[PDB]
Amino acid sequence: HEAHIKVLRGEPTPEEMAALMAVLASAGGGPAEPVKKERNMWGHPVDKLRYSVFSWQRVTLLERTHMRR
Amino acid sequence: IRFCDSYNLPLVFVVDTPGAMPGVAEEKGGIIKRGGRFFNAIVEADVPKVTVIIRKAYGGGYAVMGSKQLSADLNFAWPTARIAVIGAEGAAQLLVKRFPDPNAPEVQKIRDDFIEGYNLNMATPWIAAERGYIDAVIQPHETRLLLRKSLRLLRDKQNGPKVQRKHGLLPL
Amino acid sequence: IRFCDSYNLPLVFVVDTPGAMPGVAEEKGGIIKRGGRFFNAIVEADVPKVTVIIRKAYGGGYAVMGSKQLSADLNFAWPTARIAVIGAEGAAQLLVKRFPDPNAPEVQKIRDDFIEGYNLNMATPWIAAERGYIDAVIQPHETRLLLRKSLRLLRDKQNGPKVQRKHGLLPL
Numbered sequence: 537h538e539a540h541i542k543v544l545r546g547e548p549t550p551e552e553m554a555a556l557m558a559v560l561a562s563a564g565g566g567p568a569e570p571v572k573k574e575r576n577m578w579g580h581p582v583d584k585l586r587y588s589v590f591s592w593q594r595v596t597l598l599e600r601t602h603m604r605r
Numbered sequence: 606i607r608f609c610d611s612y613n614l615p616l617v618f619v620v621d622t623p624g625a626m627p628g629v630a631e632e633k634g635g636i637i638k639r640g641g642r643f644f645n646a647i648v649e650a651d652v653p654k655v656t657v658i659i660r661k662a663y664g665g666g667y668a669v670m671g672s673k674q675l676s677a678d679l680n681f682a683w684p685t686a687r688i689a690v691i692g693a694e695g696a697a698q699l700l701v702k703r704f705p706d707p708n709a710p711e712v713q714k715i716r717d718d719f720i721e722g723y724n725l726n727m728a729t730p731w732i733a734a735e736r737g738y739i740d741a742v743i744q745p746h747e748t749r750l751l752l753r754k755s756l757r758l759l760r761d762k763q764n765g766p767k768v769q770r771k772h773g774l775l776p777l
Numbered sequence: 778i779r780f781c782d783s784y785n786l787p788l789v790f791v792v793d794t795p796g797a798m799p800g801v802a803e804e805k806g807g808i809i810k811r812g813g814r815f816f817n818a819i820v821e822a823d824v825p826k827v828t829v830i831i832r833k834a835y836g837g838g839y840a841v842m843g844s845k846q847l848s849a850d851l852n853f854a855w856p857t858a859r860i861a862v863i864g865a866e867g868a869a870q871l872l873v874k875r876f877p878d879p880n881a882p883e884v885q886k887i888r889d890d891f892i893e894g895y896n897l898n899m900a901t902p903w904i905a906a907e908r909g910y911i912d913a914v915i916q917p918h919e920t921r922l923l924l925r926k927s928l929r930l931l932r933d934k935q936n937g938p939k940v941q942r943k944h945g946l947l948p949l
């Protein structure tokens with residue numbers, strides 16, 4: 537059920553196929569280890585704001601920002 | 606609506622209604638308090654609220670099905686929409702309550718001339734559009750991508766000003 | 778109850794009930810959800826909750842009328858109280874339906890004996906007092922001053938631990 541690369545017009549020889557795939561694999565740049573980054577809420581912007589003592593954003597912005605995981 | 610608000614699902618309304626159902630059995634069934642609870646839930650919900658009006662949107666149906674006045678964020682109508690206090694036949698009967706001799710030949714003519722005028726001039730998208738009660742009248746095919754663009758805009762909606770308190774009371 | 782909670786009034790429950798109404802007309806009338814909402818409101822409310830039981834407290838009547846298990850703070854009974862899953866007559870019907878029809882008066886005599894034993898034992902204050910489901914059995918004349926003492930104690934009640942959130946959902 538994976539999405540495969542497709543070649544739509546012409547057929548390359550095995551040498552041309554290897555060169556095409558090899559250069560595209562080289563173009564596959566990135567982190568080399570893509571995973572969920574370490575959470576660190578220290579000094580998050582939502583703690584910096586002034587909230588009125590009765591402001592509903594204390595629920596729907598501040599708390600949800602801290603508690604969401 | 607209250608469940609969706611509790612789990613932060615955006616709400617999409619697809620209106621096509623004459624409003625509350627008339628009848629003594631529905632009156633005795635609590636339709637005022639049940640409708641008031643529906644009105645309460647729509648206003649209480651903090652999630653993004655987007656509305657598309659298809660065809661009829663009369664009276665309380667217009668109001669309760671996510672009108673802009675009841676805090677809907679973006680309001681669209683198809684060109685078939687019909688926004689009014691009451692439908693043409695109800696307005697006609699409300700006029701024919703005066704000089705009410707419905708056996709007469711001409712009253713059944715002026716009824717149809719009134720209904721024609723009312724469905725051309727009143728029960729349409731265009732007064733709500735020109736007053737800005739709805740934000741756009743759209744070709745129907747636009748709807749799917751319009752809803753994507755809208756809910757992407759509203760993704761971070763913060764509702765306020767609201768006063769935090771133990772809870773909001775509701776008709777019960 | 779929800780109104781009193783919103784305006785911080787203490788709640789006093791005075792209990793004398795066989796519980797929910799039986800019957801098809803009340804079932805179709807929605808008794809399951811309306812009782813569910815009553816249970817919801819009583820558990821939701823944060824105010825002081827004080828209960829006095831006069832005679833009958835059967836089944837859901839006991840539970841819903843500010844039971845300690847539903848977070849009531851202080852619970853008292855008069856010595857006339859009867860706290861049970863069902864009253865003696867109901868338990869006698871469930872017993873006797875295991876026998877044939879009462880054509881033999883031994884069946885009637887068994888009902889009468891069972892009902893007296895049940896009203897001496899199961900349907901009394903004393904089991905709930907022995908288990909601590911109610912905090913005291915009181916002489917009726919104590920009630921007024923004991924309510925004063927109790928609500929002076931409870932004046933500063935803080936209800937918790939409760940997790941703040943948009944709202945608690947309600948049977949609708």
Ligand SMILES: CCC/C=C/C=C/C/C=C/CCCCCCCCCC(=O)SCCNC(=O)CCNC(=O)[C@H](O)C(C)(C)COP(=O)(O)OP(=O)(O)OC[C@H]1O[C@@H](n2cnc3c(N)ncnc32)[C@H](O)[C@@H]1OP(=O)(O)O
Pocket residue numbers: 644645646648649664665666668690691772773774
């Ligand atoms: C955290 C915390 C958060 C919590 C927050 C939550 C809270 C938020 C909650 C949010 C709440 C949301 C609220 C949404 C509001 C609902 C939407 C409203 C729109 C409608 O949904 S819909 C408007 C209403 N409207 C019709 O429908 C017209 C159609 N109508 C009908 O549906 C009925 O039928 C009826 C009864 C209404 C019409 O009644 P009637 O026809 O008016 O009455 P009648 O003829 O008996 O008498 C008067 C007439 O006759 C003449 N007349 C007779 N007798 C005399 C006399 N003695 N002297 C002088 N003149 C007389 C006179 O001139 C007059 O004229 P007219 O006809 O009034 O102009």
Ligand SMILES: CCC/C=C/C=C/C/C=C/CCCCCCCCCC(=O)SCCNC(=O)CCNC(=O)[C@H](O)C(C)(C)COP(=O)(O)OP(=O)(O)OC[C@H]1O[C@@H](n2cnc3c(N)ncnc32)[C@H](O)[C@@H]1OP(=O)(O)O
Pocket residue numbers: 816817818820821836837838840862863871939940941942944945946
């Ligand atoms: C941010 C903050 C937000 C905060 C939000 C907060 C919100 C939260 C709120 C929270 C909300 C609170 C939720 C609620 C609270 C709890 C309330 C519940 C307590 C009650 O409200 S409590 C009622 C009283 N409770 C009965 O009447 C039952 C019994 N009374 C009845 O009237 C019933 O209608 C019925 C149908 C059950 C009686 O009828 P039956 O019992 O079904 O049948 P039967 O007696 O004819 O069967 C024969 C019997 O003999 C035995 N037996 C021997 N052999 C067999 C056999 N082969 N097969 C079957 N049985 C057998 C056996 O004992 C059997 O009985 P069984 O098998 O045990 O049933």
